[PDB]
Symmetry: C2
Subunit: 127 residues, 2 copies
C-alpha cells in the first residue's frame, strides 16, 4: 500500500537520523524538496536539508521516532500526516522528551521510489 511504502521510507529515515547520518537522511528527499522548520526560514534543496539535519544532531536531538497516522495517494504525490517523538538535552544536560506533528508531501520519482518533497512540522504539548 502507499501507506506501507511511506512507512518503509520513514523506517529508513529514522535509521539514518539515529545513526547520525545527515547525508543519509537528506538522501530521502527530492533534490528540489523544501523543509519548513519552526522558527527558521524555509530550507530549500537537498544539500541545505542535510545541513538542517546535521544541525539537529549537533544540538543533541536524538532517538527520533515517527508514526504515520494517515496517507492519501494522488498520482505522483502522496500526502502523509503523522506524529513524532524525540529526546533533546535540557538546561540541566538531562535528556527531555519532546513530541509533535507533521505533514509531508511525498513525490514519486521516475525510478519508482517515494521521496520527501515538502516537510513541515511543529510541536505538541506533553501528554
Amino acid at each position: 500500500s502507499a501507506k506501507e511504502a511511506i512507512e518503509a521510507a520513514n523506517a529508513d529515515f529514522v535509521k539514518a537520523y539515529n545513526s547520525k547520518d545527515a547525508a543519509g537522511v537528506a538522501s530521502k528527499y527530492m533534490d528540489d524538496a523544501a523543509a519548513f522548520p519552526p522558527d527558521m526560514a524555509r530550507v530549500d534543496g537537498r544539500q541545505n536539508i542535510q545541513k538542517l539535519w546535521q544541525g539537529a544532531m549537533d544540538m543533541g536531538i536524538s532517538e527520533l521516532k515517527l508514526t504515520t497516522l494517515d496517507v492519501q495517494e494522488s498520482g505522483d504525490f502522496a500526502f502523509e500526516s503523522g506524529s513524532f517523538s524525540l529526546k533533546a538535552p535540557g538546561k540541566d544536560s538531562k535528556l527531555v522528551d519532546a513530541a509533535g506533528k507533521y505533514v509531508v508531501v511525498w513525490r514519486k520519482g521516475q525510478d519508482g521510489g517515494w521521496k520527501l518533497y515538502r516537510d513541515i512540522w511543529n510541536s505538541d504539548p506533553a501528554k
Copy 2:
C-alpha cells in the same frame, strides 16, 4: 474555464474574509469535514467542528489582521498543495499585540460539490 489555482485563490479570499470578520464558522466552513489542522504548541485538531473551535479560540485570544500570501500551488487531480506565508497581529508574551509571521503548507481537496477545501493545514513561525 476556472483553474484549480484560481479556485484556491477564491477560497483563500473567503478564508481571510471570514477570519477578519471574526466568523469562526465561516472559516471552518472552508475545510473538508474530515480535515485536520496542526497548530503549533497545541494538539492536532481533527474535523470541521473542532477546527471551528480552534479558530474561535484564536479569535478569543485576540489574534487579528490575518494576511495570507500564496507562494506555490501544485495540483494533482482532486488534490493540490499550497505553500505560503502569513502575517498577523497576536498578543506576545506580555499580552501586547505584536506582529507575527510565518509559513504554511495546505493540502487542498476538491469536494463532490466541486468546492476546493482545506484538508491539511499546518504552519509555524519564521525567525525574528
